[PDB]
Amino acid sequence: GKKIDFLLSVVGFAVDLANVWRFPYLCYKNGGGAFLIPYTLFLIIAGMPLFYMELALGQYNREGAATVWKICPFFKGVGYAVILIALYVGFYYNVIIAWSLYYLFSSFTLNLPWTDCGHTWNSPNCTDPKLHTKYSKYKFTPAAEFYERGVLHLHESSGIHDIGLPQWQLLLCLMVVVIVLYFSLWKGVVVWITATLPYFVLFVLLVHGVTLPGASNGINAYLHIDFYRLKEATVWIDAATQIFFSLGAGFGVLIAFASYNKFDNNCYRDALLTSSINCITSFVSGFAIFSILGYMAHEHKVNIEDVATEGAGLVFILYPEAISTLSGSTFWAVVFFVMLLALGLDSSMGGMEAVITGLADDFQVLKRHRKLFTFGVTFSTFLLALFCITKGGIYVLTLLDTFAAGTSILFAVLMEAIGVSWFYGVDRFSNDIQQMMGFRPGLYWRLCWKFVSPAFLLFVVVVSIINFKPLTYDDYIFPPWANWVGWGIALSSMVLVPIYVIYKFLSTQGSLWERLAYGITPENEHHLVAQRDIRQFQLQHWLAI
Numbered sequence: 001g002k003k004i005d006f007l008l009s010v011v012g013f014a015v016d017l018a019n020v021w022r023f024p025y026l027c028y029k030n031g032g033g034a035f036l037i038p039y040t041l042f043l044i045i046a047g048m049p050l051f052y053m054e055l056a057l058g059q060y061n062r063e064g065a066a067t068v069w070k071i072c073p074f075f076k077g078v079g080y081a082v083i084l085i086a087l088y089v090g091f092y093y094n095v096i097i098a099w100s101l102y103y104l105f106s107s108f109t110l111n112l113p114w115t116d117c118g119h120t121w122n123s124p125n126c127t128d129p130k131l132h133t134k135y136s137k138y139k140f141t142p143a144a145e146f147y148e149r150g151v152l153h154l155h156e157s158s159g160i161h162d163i164g165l166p167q168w169q170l171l172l173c174l175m176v177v178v179i180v181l182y183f184s185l186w187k188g189v190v191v192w193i194t195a196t197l198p199y200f201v202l203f204v205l206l207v208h209g210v211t212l213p214g215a216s217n218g219i220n221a222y223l224h225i226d227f228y229r230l231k232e233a234t235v236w237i238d239a240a241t242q243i244f245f246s247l248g249a250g251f252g253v254l255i256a257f258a259s260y261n262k263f264d265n266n267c268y269r270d271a272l273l274t275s276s277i278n279c280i281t282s283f284v285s286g287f288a289i290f291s292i293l294g295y296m297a298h299e300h301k302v303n304i305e306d307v308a309t310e311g312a313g314l315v316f317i318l319y320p321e322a323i324s325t326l327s328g329s330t331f332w333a334v335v336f337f338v339m340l341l342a343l344g345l346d347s348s349m350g351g352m353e354a355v356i357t358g359l360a361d362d363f364q365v366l367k368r369h370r371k372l373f374t375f376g377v378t379f380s381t382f383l384l385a386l387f388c389i390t391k392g393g394i395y396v397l398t399l400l401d402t403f404a405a406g407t408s409i410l411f412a413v414l415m416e417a418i419g420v421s422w423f424y425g426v427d428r429f430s431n432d433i434q435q436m437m438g439f440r441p442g443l444y445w446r447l448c449w450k451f452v453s454p455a456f457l458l459f460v461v462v463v464s465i466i467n468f469k470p471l472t473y474d475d476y477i478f479p480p481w482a483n484w485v486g487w488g489i490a491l492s493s494m495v496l497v498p499i500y501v502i503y504k505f506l507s508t509q510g511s512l513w514e515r516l517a518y519g520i521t522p523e524n525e526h527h528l529v530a531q532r533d534i535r536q537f538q539l540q541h542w543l544a545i
């Protein structure tokens with residue numbers, strides 16, 4: 001019983017809606033396997049040590065994302081930045097769950113709406129294989145037609161400048177999701193359903209998609225590595241962003257979750273198991289998705305590179321198509337979309353609780369009024385997600401998914417790593433981990449924390465800034481001002497670090513060096529500053545690993 005509970009806890013903690021929904025289309029856009037090589041490399045090098053670092057910080061300090069920086073006051077700006085990034089992500093992370101709920105509601109019938117066209121939302125150009133040529137993305141399939149016309153109603157929007165009005169069905173779905181999240185978060189701080197359904201679905205998908213008419217060529221395309229594409233840095237940027245998405249680092253979720261953990265909990269084992277399960281699940285998901293889309297390529301008589309969209313919604317075009325060919329399609333559709341709802345709800349409560357804990361640890365008034373604060377956060381998310389359910393809401397969702405995270409999250413995580421490792425001290429961090437868990441981290445962990453991970457993060461951030469491709473959605477090109485809007489969205493969270501550094505420097509009293517010492521010394525050691533004994537002002541601190 002207890003062993004099963006531990007296994008379920010680890011397995012559920014190792015899964016996210018990202019691994020199931022976002023990895024599919026990032027791997028399909030970025031190549032096949034030319035995405036897994038950067039994915040695995042970054043996973044190990046940065047994601048494992050940084051996941052471990054965030055868990056250890058949260059566990060030892062017993063503070064949220066913002067207040068954990070009492071160890072180094074100057075990085076409370078980084079804390080605020082990660083909180084803001086988590087706030088930004090929710091606006092559309094909760095609209096994907098509205099899509100999932102709409103699909104689940106549609107799944108309750110003996111004739112799935114995505115099996116063939118002939119409905120009201122169907123265009124005259126629909127082609128039913130049972131009943132293009134170039135580089136387009138084949139938006140004339142019954143499943144794609146359903147997703148884009150009976151769900152999104154995208155055909156009524158000419159672009160992000162003509163988004164239109166909110167859809168009254170996705171509106172109700174979002175209302176339901178928002179109410180559920182609030183009522184699940186309004187009291188304080190699911191594993192059985194979440195830790196089992198994703199793996200059952202993934203296993204059945206593998207077993208069924210392997211034996212399909214055209215899965216062989218899809219798998220062949222999956223297992224071909226184009227090293228012409230590792231030489232572009234788009235795959236590397238995507239891999240880094242997806243790693244920090246699936247693992248949960250950079251949003252303040254890990255610190256907030258770990259602040260409630262036991263003081264003697266083992267974070268090294270947690271990081272190891274989470275990373276291993278994440279890698280295995282990502283590889284298997286890529287395999288299954290590529291088999292499914294190779295099958296579609298065979299069925300629709302179109303090239304593997306044009307069967308499906310390369311943006312959000314690839315899963316909502318793929319998984320229904322695979323379900324339609326199973327026996328008892330209604331049962332499997334219901335099961336799969338219930339799994340999607342469970343995963344999305346778990347991740348949404350995780351992010352919202354990260355935000356709430358980070359903001360309530362800072363202010364005691366918010367802590368004393370969890371109900372009102374939770375209602376405010378939930379209502380703000382509901383409104384700024386209503387912004388994304390419009391007719392042209394897929395364009396807004398693409399803009400957000402591209403800009404809210406990405407360079408901003410990479411910068412925030414790099415700043416966190418730099419702060420801890422260099423200013424607070426990797427030696428001090430190792431001593432704290434030893435005190436918590438009884439063993440000092442190995443040399444590999446310290447090197448990754450101090451030198452390797454910050455360097456790779458800096459390289460990725462610099463490349464993502466200097467090598468920026470204008471935003472697009474399949475065959476639609478965003479207007480120039482949309483790119484400025486997205487860059488402003490990213491900068492709104494990136495700039496919070498220097499702003500808080502300047503504010504802290506100005507507010508603090510004393511001379512320049514006194515202000516610096518008060519800014520880099522832990523709040524509980526501020527009585528050393530009067531004694532002129534600061535470790536950071538000695539070469540030994542900066543020359544110690």
Ligand SMILES: NCCc1ccc(O)c(O)c1
Pocket residue numbers: 016018085086087088089090091093094244245246247248251253347348349350351352
């Ligand atoms: N892995 C990130 C999960 C996450 C983060 C922030 C959110 O607002 C959310 O709904 C979900």
Ligand SMILES: NCCc1ccc(O)c(O)c1
Pocket residue numbers: 028029030031032221222304305
């Ligand atoms: N940019 C298109 C993505 C893609 C997916 C699979 C392939 O086999 C391939 O050559 C290309």
Ligand SMILES: [Cl-]
Pocket residue numbers: 018019023242243246282
């Ligand atoms: Cl992933």
